[PDB]
Homo-oligomer: A and B are copies of this chain.
Amino acid sequence: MSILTETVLPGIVQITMNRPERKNALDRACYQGLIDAITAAEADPDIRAMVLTGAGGCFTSGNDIKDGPRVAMDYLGVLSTAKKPIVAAVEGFAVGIGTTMLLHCDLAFAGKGASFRMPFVALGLSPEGASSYLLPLIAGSKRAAELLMLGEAFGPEIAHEAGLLNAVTPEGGALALAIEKARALAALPPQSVALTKMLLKRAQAPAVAETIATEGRLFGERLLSAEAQAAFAAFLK
């Protein structure tokens, strides 16, 4: 119950990652909570768009180290196959699955001061979220290599240039823009919106599902490597 859900406007549900003490870090129940909200909103004929965001000037710092990867994979599988529009609004940290889940949102906006990173390689792990398939397609392979292979931190402007964001707002302004765009989505003919999203994703969809499964298997392998063991011990200083 660290995942907030409210109908904030007609046709629009807002799903909020709410754990600011731990930078909205995703607990196992958070993944379940996120699966429940999306599922309910998909089944709800009231609802024509979803906005996804985090509380307290933070999006999410990613997977909670304390609170294997199968539930993360279930969430990505749910997120990537949702039939209705999903609009993301990012402030502060969007790290790990914080970044890669943006790949499956139809629209994404971040304020200045946002900080993105995929540090899987540095933890002796491997890509997730179908990032190893999608990111070369939307960012070009050069940029996909600097972000996934080097695991460089990056700001919203690079995130725009890399195909992760439609637009950068000033700081604290991403949610207002996200809600505006969700409103315009909700005012459109919903069947036509759904058909368009499905056709937009038609060519990538089987490769995304097979990539999530293949990444998950390797990620599970990598969680058992000596490199991951040493890197986590290094990450705890």
Contacts and interface: CB of A to CB of B under 8 A. Distances in A.
Contacts of A191: 124, 225, 227
Interface stretch (A19-27, A58-66, A69-77, A181-189): A181-189
Contact of A199 (B142, B193, B215): B215
A193 B139 CA distance: 19
Q: How many of these chains are in the complex? A: 3
A185 B150 contact: yes
Interface stretch (A7-15, A38-46, A161-169): A161-169
A122 to B, nearest CB: 6
Interface in A143-163: 143-146, 148-151, 163
A137 B124 CA distance: 29
Contact of A196 (B85, B127, B185, B201): B127
B196 A107 contact: no
Contact of A132 (B85, B150, B188, B202): B202
A201 B211 CA distance: 12
A111 B218 CA distance: 38
A99 B141 CA distance: 15
B142 A165 contact: yes
Contacts of A132: 196, 199-200, 202
Contacts of A138: 140-142
A149 B190 CA distance: 10
A189 B126 contact: no
Interface residues of A, number: 64
A204 interface: yes
A45 to B, nearest CB: 15
Nearest to A143: B166
Contacts of A185: 149-150
A207 interface: yes
A233 interface: no
The listed residue with most B CB atoms (<10 A of its CB), out of A134, A146, A214, A231, is A146
A197 interface: yes
